Amino acid sequence: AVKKFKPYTPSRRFMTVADFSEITKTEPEKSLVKPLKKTGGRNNQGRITVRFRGGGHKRLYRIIDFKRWDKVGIPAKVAAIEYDPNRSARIALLHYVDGEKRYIIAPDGLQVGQQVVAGPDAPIQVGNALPLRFIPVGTVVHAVELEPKKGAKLARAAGTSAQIQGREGDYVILRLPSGELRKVHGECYATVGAVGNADHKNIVLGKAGRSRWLGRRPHVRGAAMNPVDHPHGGGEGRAPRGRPPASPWGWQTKGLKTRKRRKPSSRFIIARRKK
Amino acid sequence: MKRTWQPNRRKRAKTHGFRARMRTPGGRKVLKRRRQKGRWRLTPAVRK
RNA sequence: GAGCUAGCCCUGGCCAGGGUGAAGCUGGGGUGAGACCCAGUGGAGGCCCGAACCGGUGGGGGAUGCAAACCCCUCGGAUGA
RNA sequence: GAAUGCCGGCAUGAGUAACGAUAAAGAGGGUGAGAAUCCCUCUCGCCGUAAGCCCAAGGGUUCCUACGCAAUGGUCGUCAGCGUAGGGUUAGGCGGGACCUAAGGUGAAGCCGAAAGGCGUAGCCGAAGGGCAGCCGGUUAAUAUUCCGGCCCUUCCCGCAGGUGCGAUGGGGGGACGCUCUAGGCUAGGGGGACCGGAGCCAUGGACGAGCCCGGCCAGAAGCGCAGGGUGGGAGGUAGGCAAAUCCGCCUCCCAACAAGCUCUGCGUGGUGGGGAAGCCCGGGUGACAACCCCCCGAAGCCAGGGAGCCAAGAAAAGCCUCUAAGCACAACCUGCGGGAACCCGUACCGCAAACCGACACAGGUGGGCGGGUGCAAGAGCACUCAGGCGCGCGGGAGAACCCUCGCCAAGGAACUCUGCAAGUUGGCCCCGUAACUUCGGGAGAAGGGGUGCUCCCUGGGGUGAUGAGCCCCGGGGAGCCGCAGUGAACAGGCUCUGGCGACUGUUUACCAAAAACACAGCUCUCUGCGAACUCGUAAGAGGAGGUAUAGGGAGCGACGCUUGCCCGGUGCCGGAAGGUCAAGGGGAGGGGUGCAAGCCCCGAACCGAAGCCCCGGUGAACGGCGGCCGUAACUAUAACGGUCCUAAGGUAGCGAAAUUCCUUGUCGGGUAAGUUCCGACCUGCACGAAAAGCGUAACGACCGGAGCGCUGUCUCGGCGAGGGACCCGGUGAAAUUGAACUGGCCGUGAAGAUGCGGCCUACCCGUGGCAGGACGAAAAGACCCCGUGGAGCUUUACUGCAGCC
RNA sequence: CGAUGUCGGCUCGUCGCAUCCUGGGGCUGAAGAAGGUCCCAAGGGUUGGGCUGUUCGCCCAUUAAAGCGGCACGCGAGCUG
RNA sequence: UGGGAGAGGGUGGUGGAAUUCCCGGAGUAGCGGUGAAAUGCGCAGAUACCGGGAGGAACGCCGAUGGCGAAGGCAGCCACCUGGUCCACCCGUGACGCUGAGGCGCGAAAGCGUGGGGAGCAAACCGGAUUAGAUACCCGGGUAGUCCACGCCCUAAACG
RNA sequence: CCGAGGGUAGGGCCCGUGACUGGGGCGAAGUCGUAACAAGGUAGCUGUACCGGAAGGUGCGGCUGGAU
Ligand SMILES: CC[C@H]1OC(=O)[C@H](C)[C@@H](O[C@H]2C[C@@](C)(OC)[C@@H](O)[C@H](C)O2)[C@H](C)[C@@H](O[C@@H]2O[C@H](C)C[C@H](N(C)C)[C@H]2O)[C@](C)(O)C[C@@H](C)CN(C)[C@H](C)[C@@H](O)[C@]1(C)O
Ligand SMILES: [Mg+2]
Ligand SMILES: [Mg+2]
Ligand SMILES: [Mg+2]
Ligand SMILES: [Mg+2]
Ligand SMILES: [Mg+2]
Ligand SMILES: [Mg+2]
Ligand SMILES: [Mg+2]
Ligand SMILES: [Mg+2]
Ligand SMILES: [Mg+2]
Ligand SMILES: [Mg+2]
Ligand SMILES: [Mg+2]
Ligand SMILES: [Mg+2]
Ligand SMILES: [Mg+2]
Ligand SMILES: [Mg+2]
Ligand SMILES: [Mg+2]
Ligand SMILES: [Mg+2]
Ligand SMILES: [Mg+2]
Ligand SMILES: [Mg+2]
Ligand SMILES: [Mg+2]
Ligand SMILES: [Mg+2]
Ligand SMILES: [Mg+2]
Ligand SMILES: [Mg+2]
Ligand SMILES: [Mg+2]
Ligand SMILES: [Mg+2]
Ligand SMILES: [Mg+2]
Ligand SMILES: [Mg+2]
Ligand SMILES: [Mg+2]
Ligand SMILES: [Mg+2]
Ligand SMILES: [Mg+2]
Ligand SMILES: [Mg+2]
Ligand SMILES: [Mg+2]
Ligand SMILES: [Mg+2]
Ligand SMILES: [Mg+2]
Ligand SMILES: [Mg+2]
Ligand SMILES: [Mg+2]
Ligand SMILES: [Mg+2]
Ligand SMILES: [Mg+2]
Ligand SMILES: [Mg+2]
Ligand SMILES: [Mg+2]
Ligand SMILES: [Mg+2]
Ligand SMILES: [Mg+2]
Ligand SMILES: [Mg+2]
Ligand SMILES: [Mg+2]
Ligand SMILES: [Mg+2]
Ligand SMILES: [Mg+2]
Ligand SMILES: [Mg+2]
Ligand SMILES: [Mg+2]
Ligand SMILES: [Mg+2]
Ligand SMILES: [Mg+2]
Ligand SMILES: [Mg+2]
Ligand SMILES: [Mg+2]
Ligand SMILES: [Mg+2]
Ligand SMILES: [Mg+2]
Ligand SMILES: [Mg+2]
Ligand SMILES: [Mg+2]
Ligand SMILES: [Mg+2]
Ligand SMILES: [Mg+2]
Ligand SMILES: [Mg+2]
Ligand SMILES: [Mg+2]
Ligand SMILES: [Mg+2]
Ligand SMILES: [Mg+2]
Ligand SMILES: [Mg+2]
Ligand SMILES: [Mg+2]
Ligand SMILES: [Mg+2]
Ligand SMILES: [Mg+2]
Ligand SMILES: [Mg+2]
Ligand SMILES: [Mg+2]
Ligand SMILES: [Mg+2]
Ligand SMILES: [Mg+2]
Ligand SMILES: [Mg+2]
Ligand SMILES: [Mg+2]
Ligand SMILES: [Mg+2]
Ligand SMILES: [Mg+2]
Ligand SMILES: [Mg+2]
Ligand SMILES: [Mg+2]
Ligand SMILES: [Mg+2]
Ligand SMILES: [Mg+2]
Ligand SMILES: [Mg+2]
Ligand SMILES: [Mg+2]
Ligand SMILES: [Mg+2]
Ligand SMILES: [Mg+2]
Ligand SMILES: [Mg+2]
Ligand SMILES: [Mg+2]
Ligand SMILES: [Mg+2]
Ligand SMILES: [Mg+2]
Ligand SMILES: [Mg+2]
Ligand SMILES: [Mg+2]
Ligand SMILES: [Mg+2]
Ligand SMILES: [Mg+2]
Ligand SMILES: [Mg+2]
Ligand SMILES: [Mg+2]
Ligand SMILES: [Mg+2]
Ligand SMILES: [Mg+2]
Ligand SMILES: [Mg+2]
Ligand SMILES: [Mg+2]
Ligand SMILES: [Mg+2]
Ligand SMILES: [Mg+2]
Ligand SMILES: [Mg+2]
Ligand SMILES: [Mg+2]
Ligand SMILES: [Mg+2]
Ligand SMILES: [Mg+2]
Ligand SMILES: [Mg+2]
Ligand SMILES: [Mg+2]
Ligand SMILES: [Mg+2]
Ligand SMILES: [Mg+2]
Ligand SMILES: [Mg+2]
Ligand SMILES: [Mg+2]
Ligand SMILES: [Mg+2]
Ligand SMILES: [Mg+2]
Ligand SMILES: [Mg+2]
Ligand SMILES: [Mg+2]
Ligand SMILES: [Mg+2]
Ligand SMILES: [Mg+2]
Ligand SMILES: [Mg+2]
Ligand SMILES: [Mg+2]
Ligand SMILES: [Mg+2]
Ligand SMILES: [Mg+2]
Ligand SMILES: [Mg+2]
Ligand SMILES: [Mg+2]
Ligand SMILES: [Mg+2]
Ligand SMILES: [Mg+2]
Ligand SMILES: [Mg+2]
Ligand SMILES: [Mg+2]
Ligand SMILES: [Mg+2]
Ligand SMILES: [Mg+2]
Ligand SMILES: [Mg+2]
Ligand SMILES: [Mg+2]
Ligand SMILES: [Mg+2]
Ligand SMILES: [Mg+2]
Ligand SMILES: [Mg+2]
Ligand SMILES: [Mg+2]
Ligand SMILES: [Mg+2]
Ligand SMILES: [Mg+2]
Ligand SMILES: [Mg+2]
Ligand SMILES: [Mg+2]
Ligand SMILES: [Mg+2]
Ligand SMILES: [Mg+2]
Ligand SMILES: [Mg+2]
Ligand SMILES: [Mg+2]
Ligand SMILES: [Mg+2]
Ligand SMILES: [Mg+2]
Ligand SMILES: [Mg+2]
Ligand SMILES: [Mg+2]
Ligand SMILES: [Mg+2]
Ligand SMILES: [Mg+2]
Ligand SMILES: [Mg+2]
Ligand SMILES: [Mg+2]
Ligand SMILES: [Mg+2]
Ligand SMILES: [Mg+2]
Ligand SMILES: [Mg+2]
Ligand SMILES: [Mg+2]
Ligand SMILES: [Mg+2]
Ligand SMILES: [Mg+2]
Ligand SMILES: [Mg+2]
Ligand SMILES: [Mg+2]
Ligand SMILES: [Mg+2]
Ligand SMILES: [Mg+2]
Ligand SMILES: [Mg+2]
Ligand SMILES: [Mg+2]
Ligand SMILES: [Mg+2]
Ligand SMILES: [Mg+2]
Ligand SMILES: [Mg+2]
Ligand SMILES: [Mg+2]
Ligand SMILES: [Mg+2]
Ligand SMILES: [Mg+2]
Ligand SMILES: [Mg+2]
Ligand SMILES: [Mg+2]
Ligand SMILES: [Mg+2]
Ligand SMILES: [Mg+2]
Ligand SMILES: [Mg+2]
Ligand SMILES: [Mg+2]
Ligand SMILES: [Mg+2]
Ligand SMILES: [Mg+2]
Ligand SMILES: [Mg+2]
Ligand SMILES: [Mg+2]
Ligand SMILES: [Mg+2]
Ligand SMILES: [Mg+2]
Ligand SMILES: [Mg+2]
Ligand SMILES: [Mg+2]
Ligand SMILES: [Mg+2]
Ligand SMILES: [Mg+2]
Ligand SMILES: [Mg+2]
Ligand SMILES: [Mg+2]
Ligand SMILES: [Mg+2]
Ligand SMILES: [Mg+2]
Ligand SMILES: [Mg+2]
Ligand SMILES: [Mg+2]
Ligand SMILES: [Mg+2]
Ligand SMILES: [Mg+2]
Ligand SMILES: [Mg+2]
Ligand SMILES: [Mg+2]
Ligand SMILES: [Mg+2]
Ligand SMILES: [Mg+2]
Ligand SMILES: [Mg+2]
Ligand SMILES: [Mg+2]
Ligand SMILES: [Mg+2]
Ligand SMILES: [Mg+2]
Ligand SMILES: [Mg+2]
Ligand SMILES: [Mg+2]
Ligand SMILES: [Mg+2]
Ligand SMILES: [Mg+2]
Ligand SMILES: [Mg+2]
Ligand SMILES: [Mg+2]
Ligand SMILES: [Mg+2]
Ligand SMILES: [Mg+2]
Ligand SMILES: [Mg+2]
Ligand SMILES: [Mg+2]
Ligand SMILES: [Mg+2]
Ligand SMILES: [Mg+2]
Ligand SMILES: [Mg+2]
Ligand SMILES: [Mg+2]
Ligand SMILES: [Mg+2]
Ligand SMILES: [Mg+2]
Ligand SMILES: [Mg+2]
Ligand SMILES: [Mg+2]
Ligand SMILES: [Mg+2]
Ligand SMILES: [Mg+2]
Ligand SMILES: [Mg+2]
Ligand SMILES: [Mg+2]
Ligand SMILES: [Mg+2]
Ligand SMILES: [Mg+2]
Ligand SMILES: [Mg+2]
Ligand SMILES: [Mg+2]
Ligand SMILES: [Mg+2]
Ligand SMILES: [Mg+2]
Ligand SMILES: [Mg+2]
Ligand SMILES: [Mg+2]
Ligand SMILES: [Mg+2]
Ligand SMILES: [Mg+2]
Ligand SMILES: [Mg+2]
Ligand SMILES: [Mg+2]
Ligand SMILES: [Mg+2]
Ligand SMILES: [Mg+2]
Ligand SMILES: [Mg+2]
Ligand SMILES: [Mg+2]
Ligand SMILES: [Mg+2]
Ligand SMILES: [Mg+2]
Ligand SMILES: [Mg+2]
Ligand SMILES: [Mg+2]
Ligand SMILES: [Mg+2]
Ligand SMILES: [Mg+2]
Ligand SMILES: [Mg+2]
Ligand SMILES: [Mg+2]
Ligand SMILES: [Mg+2]
Ligand SMILES: [Mg+2]
Ligand SMILES: [Mg+2]
Ligand SMILES: [Mg+2]
Ligand SMILES: [Mg+2]
Ligand SMILES: [Mg+2]
């Protein structure tokens, strides 16, 4: 559920907030946060390399466990579900019977109080992580690794998930969130379930100030610039594009495919994304 | 109205100072040239 | 050469007083249970009026200037991008 | 002798403009060669959320005293931020360093680059952030938390006593955090006192008084008191916190738990040390053996790391505490006490300014703290005023035109004008009241009106007391009084109706444009499977992102409502293992040079041979495009209908003389006495039209139109008055410009607009205040325009390259 | 072209006369009154509004009349813009 | 109290046939479609056949002139939660009843909003035919929609 | 004091009227086609939705008031 506002200001008419209902703890585990060094979009030369970034709210980075095969067999209790400003998913604090504490991204349906575990022998229940070859075909999973022991790479955003669709040799066939059909090694880990906070995509930002809180500086159209700035610059009064629509750098931006053609991973991608 | 010279000793020393010149091919050529011209000061004096 | 200016990064600081009165909560009403309604409480907001502060709308002055952009009157924002 | 030449000197304009805020001066006394200008006294005015006080930048002796006045000072000068000289800045506790990390910078290891160099985990550096021990008073011409005085405190070293498994750059805890709102209790600061202390005063009609005037505190170890912050205790298990661990984490059990306990801070008190007014008298003396008390108001400050709520989810590292490892356990550490030790740099003065940034003693710019009182609803607003500081470094007259800033105006009331430009009007608070429309918030301070002072009387609730008096905050009712007028001064919306554009708050051409432009939430297309795409870089490395398709990049459109048609022939993009074309390379029929020869060397056909292009499809919120002619209906007119040429296809819905309409002031209607504008219609749309979006839309706008009401010197149409200039006298004294000048009018002439030529007319010599018609007046080697085989920015299916990609 | 500032308005005029009015005339298809047309005449006079940047023009209400031209399409070291 | 029948409703699961698409094989000169045709698809290897996979929707036979519901309407199968109704006993209450303006709830399909999903079908649309013409009927394509969740809409030859 | 009413301001209801515009009825002597009544030459009707010179068409679902 997403929360609306009465229109007692022009911007509150449309503004919506997350309901934050799943959140049981309002402070991060101190041993698990580090400062997040804001960049402004500038690289190590001082140069803007990603436009329109900067000036968002201060954040601490919560250390997330994207491995979990780190601790095979050691169960843990779901102690809390917390807010994480560095991602759309919520995070879940785990208390291992080890006494070690860790964050994972909170799956849909996770319950504070329940227990989860990782390993080849783990039950097929929401919150547990297994190598891909031990999860039944048809199971929806998230936090999927792409290569063994390299870290969960796929299906990490709010409400996303991948589905297992078959097996073939050492690999298992996944349907990624994008709809792509891809081979992933069977030894890659995944966590059964879908990522939570699925209402994330129904948030209406509401005003320009809200993008600013998120670190998004105003984006300015090429058409509003001059020929020294952008292919769409200049013209007297308003102008149509007057050429194939292009980026600030001249490459075409309405259909031009851009994945590198001789890329080794193409052997493992069965079907390009649909839609 | 606010003008262009707003003196600041740390800024002066860190920007035009002797050590800043020495760290850099172009800066050592400034010192070499000013020495060759016989300048009395090779670098702005800043109080510290 | 970024001690002016533009953007960003780190760390500090500032914004008189007044006005409006969102959610929620409590009580009452209502119903099979509800929705909802009323009152109180509450104190939200690129909300309102207005100083500091930030501006520079219209007019007047100035025009070998007090000033290589100033002055008076008026005017915009003033918890926020 | 000329180059708007160059350097210098000196003229002209000219005793002219000006002398830098209109906060303001007058007199007496003194000094001196000289005094509007220096010192002193009295009077007057100005600032007082500052124009007063303190701190940080920056400045660098400008500070204090003596002696000076050539120059500097917009005049003067005896004076000075000026000249000469002498003096002046005192710290274990204030700030910085011998502590910590932030961005960033640097950088063992490592990586990269023709060279120079670029990067880079650790580490190091880096502060106005973290951490750390001093308060009050006195003293100097000039320093003071630094000297002195009183009362306090920190670290290091050594020793003594007691206690303990001591020991770290390693483990852990803590340090450690947002925004808005906010409780309790305090303090700062303030108001009052018929009480306490005090030199005195009785004026001019009254008052010897519960009179007037003045003051009535500051710091303070331990202890104690009030108020707060922080913190659960024990045992057992233990596989996690890259070794170890008794610590921390996890599990269980017992007790304690909104109590307490322990601990820490604030405030009060506190041995003790200080301070101490008006007035009088020559900074000091006196007041004075000063008194030093009660009531009230009360922070944004303190307790603090308090509490709640919210989403955008809010540094690090050390000090500190705890754990153990080597080790070492006669040590080491902890606690108490004692003695000793305790370095370097800054410290003057200015500091919203005459000492900083602006060439100037420049109406400009400059971060933090304190910033009293009364009244006005509040307040840091406004008026006055305290402490404190000033009167702005040319003056004296005069009383013209004109200019500036200001005040008022008969009758009219927008008739002004591009426009009510400007200026009036309105104006705070309380009460009554308030429309279309609406996204149900709003529109709204709609509009419109009523009240507002003072006196007496009665009374209501809150705060503090105590539950009462007193004080204080918010009120209420009745009866009266005065004036032209009661937010009596200062600060404080004119309003309404209706269109265009943009939804909205925001942003912008620093210094001619603030807008309808940019942005914006939101909508759609598209790219991207993660060593992502994309961006910067030769690279390494970075950003993206410590993110992962509910994500990230690119593009257009721009809240929201209802919508977004047809054309894929061309261009783009996407798909297509066929076919055609296709480079290097492969192949080697055949041919050539040379040699006596084996041989060496060269040319070279078929055939094989990628991307790209051709070709086949798809694709519009991709670039874009979206017809013409003839005929036809009981009068006319028109044409639902038919025919025909062309096209890739012929503009759908909606809107339309429009931010678009040439003809054009189209025509009709509305408003007006009169309407090229405005509003409403019509549709022959020169030349609207659907995300360079179409048509609407409440609310919003220093946007741009049109109308009305109110009110006015905008105007009829001008008048008077004020001050600052202008004018006269004393002081100081520029500027552009200038071929030289002994520089009149007409009609002619002249390179075609003559003071300068001809004819004629007119005219004694020289100034001062004024006005601008001429000197084709000044300024700027015309921006327009052209020319130059001049330049530069920008575009593209111009040429030719390059990067990048294939 | 080493610069001769431009429309329109305002202000301030002055001139020409091919005269709009007022004065004097002849002819008339001049009864009168009112006109028409031409001649003489430049002394003075020649309104206020709505629209539009406008000049011009149209219109409202008046008038004896609501003249037309020149003066760098008079006049920006006079103003406006 | 004791029994019954039933596509009554709601939720979670789950099975098979078929269609379409994708991959592998095998194969070649057409397939498709109609009254007859053409557009279309097919030597860039279609149709027909075999194997594998994905995905959505609807449930063949049973099935009836049947059953249930107040109406709309409900059909594979399993479970859970839940409504109405019939019978037998004649045991309990003692007229507690009938109707019902307003009210409230439910209400096929289409349609709307926000998400998802999308095989087949198919308004709009494009093309081929038919025809005097053919903005149709028929044929080849084709987007909303049809499906799920939640919220609206409240209509009907909502009929016996 | 109250007070006829006058004045200022803002609302509500009704009537008349208005450039232009929407459809309706009647007229009939026209133009276009032929949607319905027969299986009306695509059974009809229907709610809704989208479309078309027009009657209408199509989709989805419903009714028989459908011939054979
Ligand atoms: C406001 C102060 C300024 O003074 C002005 O603005 C004047 C009103 C300006 O005038 C303004 C306003 C305006 C309307 O003047 C007519 C405009 O056209 C010009 C460009 O500038 C002048 C008349 C222009 O001089 C005009 O240059 C035109 C191109 C041609 C014209 N011709 C008539 C010869 C000539 O007078 C000029 C070129 O600006 C002057 C030039 C010599 C020097 N300027 C550079 C100076 C520094 C000015 O900035 C200034 C003194 O500070
Ligand atoms: Mg909302
Ligand atoms: Mg709300
Ligand atoms: Mg709500
Ligand atoms: Mg709004
Ligand atoms: Mg919420
Ligand atoms: Mg949540
Ligand atoms: Mg939730
Ligand atoms: Mg926090
Ligand atoms: Mg990080
Ligand atoms: Mg980072
Ligand atoms: Mg760096
Ligand atoms: Mg760098
Ligand atoms: Mg970018
Ligand atoms: Mg950026
Ligand atoms: Mg989160
Ligand atoms: Mg969310
Ligand atoms: Mg959104
Ligand atoms: Mg953010
Ligand atoms: Mg964006
Ligand atoms: Mg933009
Ligand atoms: Mg532009
Ligand atoms: Mg550039
Ligand atoms: Mg370019
Ligand atoms: Mg370009
Ligand atoms: Mg362009
Ligand atoms: Mg253009
Ligand atoms: Mg343009
Ligand atoms: Mg433009
Ligand atoms: Mg254009
Ligand atoms: Mg443009
Ligand atoms: Mg634009
Ligand atoms: Mg263009
Ligand atoms: Mg375009
Ligand atoms: Mg083009
Ligand atoms: Mg891979
Ligand atoms: Mg500065
Ligand atoms: Mg300096
Ligand atoms: Mg400095
Ligand atoms: Mg500094
Ligand atoms: Mg600096
Ligand atoms: Mg230096
Ligand atoms: Mg020098
Ligand atoms: Mg020397
Ligand atoms: Mg130097
Ligand atoms: Mg540099
Ligand atoms: Mg700077
Ligand atoms: Mg900070
Ligand atoms: Mg503020
Ligand atoms: Mg309230
Ligand atoms: Mg609450
Ligand atoms: Mg605001
Ligand atoms: Mg406001
Ligand atoms: Mg201004
Ligand atoms: Mg004004
Ligand atoms: Mg004025
Ligand atoms: Mg100027
Ligand atoms: Mg000013
Ligand atoms: Mg001013
Ligand atoms: Mg104002
Ligand atoms: Mg305001
Ligand atoms: Mg405010
Ligand atoms: Mg704001
Ligand atoms: Mg010569
Ligand atoms: Mg010269
Ligand atoms: Mg000269
Ligand atoms: Mg010269
Ligand atoms: Mg010279
Ligand atoms: Mg001379
Ligand atoms: Mg002169
Ligand atoms: Mg002069
Ligand atoms: Mg001057
Ligand atoms: Mg003044
Ligand atoms: Mg003197
Ligand atoms: Mg003198
Ligand atoms: Mg004096
Ligand atoms: Mg200096
Ligand atoms: Mg001193
Ligand atoms: Mg002197
Ligand atoms: Mg002198
Ligand atoms: Mg001097
Ligand atoms: Mg001076
Ligand atoms: Mg002397
Ligand atoms: Mg001086
Ligand atoms: Mg001395
Ligand atoms: Mg000391
Ligand atoms: Mg030392
Ligand atoms: Mg520090
Ligand atoms: Mg102290
Ligand atoms: Mg001293
Ligand atoms: Mg932290
Ligand atoms: Mg901090
Ligand atoms: Mg804030
Ligand atoms: Mg007080
Ligand atoms: Mg207390
Ligand atoms: Mg253990
Ligand atoms: Mg004393
Ligand atoms: Mg004494
Ligand atoms: Mg405050
Ligand atoms: Mg959020
Ligand atoms: Mg760090
Ligand atoms: Mg040992
Ligand atoms: Mg101990
Ligand atoms: Mg030392
Ligand atoms: Mg020193
Ligand atoms: Mg000092
Ligand atoms: Mg100032
Ligand atoms: Mg100086
Ligand atoms: Mg200057
Ligand atoms: Mg300068
Ligand atoms: Mg001065
Ligand atoms: Mg100054
Ligand atoms: Mg004070
Ligand atoms: Mg007031
Ligand atoms: Mg007030
Ligand atoms: Mg004010
Ligand atoms: Mg006072
Ligand atoms: Mg003065
Ligand atoms: Mg005079
Ligand atoms: Mg008057
Ligand atoms: Mg009027
Ligand atoms: Mg009037
Ligand atoms: Mg106007
Ligand atoms: Mg007022
Ligand atoms: Mg109204
Ligand atoms: Mg409303
Ligand atoms: Mg609102
Ligand atoms: Mg009012
Ligand atoms: Mg209004
Ligand atoms: Mg009185
Ligand atoms: Mg008065
Ligand atoms: Mg005043
Ligand atoms: Mg106001
Ligand atoms: Mg209105
Ligand atoms: Mg218009
Ligand atoms: Mg609009
Ligand atoms: Mg706007
Ligand atoms: Mg705009
Ligand atoms: Mg809008
Ligand atoms: Mg918008
Ligand atoms: Mg906006
Ligand atoms: Mg604002
Ligand atoms: Mg500008
Ligand atoms: Mg400019
Ligand atoms: Mg400029
Ligand atoms: Mg400039
Ligand atoms: Mg500029
Ligand atoms: Mg301006
Ligand atoms: Mg501007
Ligand atoms: Mg503005
Ligand atoms: Mg915009
Ligand atoms: Mg939109
Ligand atoms: Mg690059
Ligand atoms: Mg890297
Ligand atoms: Mg990265
Ligand atoms: Mg990163
Ligand atoms: Mg990402
Ligand atoms: Mg925009
Ligand atoms: Mg609407
Ligand atoms: Mg069309
Ligand atoms: Mg096309
Ligand atoms: Mg194409
Ligand atoms: Mg093209
Ligand atoms: Mg031979
Ligand atoms: Mg579309
Ligand atoms: Mg084309
Ligand atoms: Mg286009
Ligand atoms: Mg006819
Ligand atoms: Mg057209
Ligand atoms: Mg039209
Ligand atoms: Mg229009
Ligand atoms: Mg047009
Ligand atoms: Mg034209
Ligand atoms: Mg026109
Ligand atoms: Mg026109
Ligand atoms: Mg007209
Ligand atoms: Mg107009
Ligand atoms: Mg106009
Ligand atoms: Mg027409
Ligand atoms: Mg565009
Ligand atoms: Mg446009
Ligand atoms: Mg609007
Ligand atoms: Mg505006
Ligand atoms: Mg006047
Ligand atoms: Mg007067
Ligand atoms: Mg006067
Ligand atoms: Mg005067
Ligand atoms: Mg005067
Ligand atoms: Mg005289
Ligand atoms: Mg001469
Ligand atoms: Mg001439
Ligand atoms: Mg001449
Ligand atoms: Mg002549
Ligand atoms: Mg002459
Ligand atoms: Mg001569
Ligand atoms: Mg001669
Ligand atoms: Mg002569
Ligand atoms: Mg003469
Ligand atoms: Mg003379
Ligand atoms: Mg003249
Ligand atoms: Mg002149
Ligand atoms: Mg002359
Ligand atoms: Mg002249
Ligand atoms: Mg001239
Ligand atoms: Mg030149
Ligand atoms: Mg030239
Ligand atoms: Mg030129
Ligand atoms: Mg020039
Ligand atoms: Mg030319
Ligand atoms: Mg040429
Ligand atoms: Mg030539
Ligand atoms: Mg040339
Ligand atoms: Mg060029
Ligand atoms: Mg590329
Ligand atoms: Mg010229
Ligand atoms: Mg010249
Ligand atoms: Mg010139
Ligand atoms: Mg007659
Ligand atoms: Mg005659
Ligand atoms: Mg005359
Ligand atoms: Mg005359
Ligand atoms: Mg005209
Ligand atoms: Mg006309
Ligand atoms: Mg008459
Ligand atoms: Mg007459
Ligand atoms: Mg003329
Ligand atoms: Mg002419
Ligand atoms: Mg002309
Ligand atoms: Mg002129
Ligand atoms: Mg001018
Ligand atoms: Mg003019
Ligand atoms: Mg002239
Ligand atoms: Mg004008
Ligand atoms: Mg073949
Ligand atoms: Mg059957
Ligand atoms: Mg019985
Ligand atoms: Mg329904
Ligand atoms: Mg539907
Ligand atoms: Mg036809
Ligand atoms: Mg549709
Ligand atoms: Mg749709
Ligand atoms: Mg039936
Ligand atoms: Mg009356
Ligand atoms: Mg028929
Ligand atoms: Mg039929
Ligand atoms: Mg139609
Ligand atoms: Mg038609
Ligand atoms: Mg159809
Ligand atoms: Mg039915
Ligand atoms: Mg029948």
Residue numbers in the entry:
A (entry chain 1D): 2 to 276
B (entry chain 17): 1 to 48
Anything the authors wrote about it?
The activity of HygA-macrolide pairs against bacteria harboring erm resistance genes prompted us to determine X-ray crystal structures of HygA-macrolide combinations bound to the Erm-methylated 70S ribosome containing N6-dimethylated residue m26A2058. Using our recent methodology, Erm-modified 70S ribosomes were isolated from Tth cells expressing the erm-like gene from Bifidobacterium thermophilum. Co-crystallization of these Erm-methylated ribosomes with PY and the same HygA-macrolide pairs as before (HygA-ERY, HygA-AZI, and HygA-TEL) provided crystals diffracting to 2.35–2.65 Å resolution. Remarkably, the observed electron-density maps revealed strong peaks corresponding to HygA and the macrolides (ERY, AZI, or TEL) bound to the A2058-N6-dimethylated ribosomes (respectively), allowing us to build molecular models unambiguously. In the WT ribosome, this water molecule is coordinated by the nucleobase of A2058 and the phosphate of G2505 and serves as a binding partner for the dimethylamino moiety of the functionally critical desosamine sugar of a macrolide. In the Erm-methylated ribosome, this water molecule is displaced due to direct sterical hindrance with the methyl groups appended to the A2058 residue, rationalizing the significantly reduced affinity of macrolides to the Erm-modified ribosome. However, the overall binding positions of ERY, AZI, or TEL on the A2058-methylated 70S ribosome in the presence of HygA appear to be nearly identical to their binding sites in the WT ribosome. Interestingly, the dimethylamino moiety of the desosamine sugars of ERY, AZI, or TEL rotates by ~180° around the C-N bond and finds a new H-bonding partner—the carbonyl oxygen of the fucofuranose ring of ribosome-bound HygA. The distance between the H-bonding N and C atoms is 3.2–3.5 Å, pointing to the rather weak character of this H-bond.
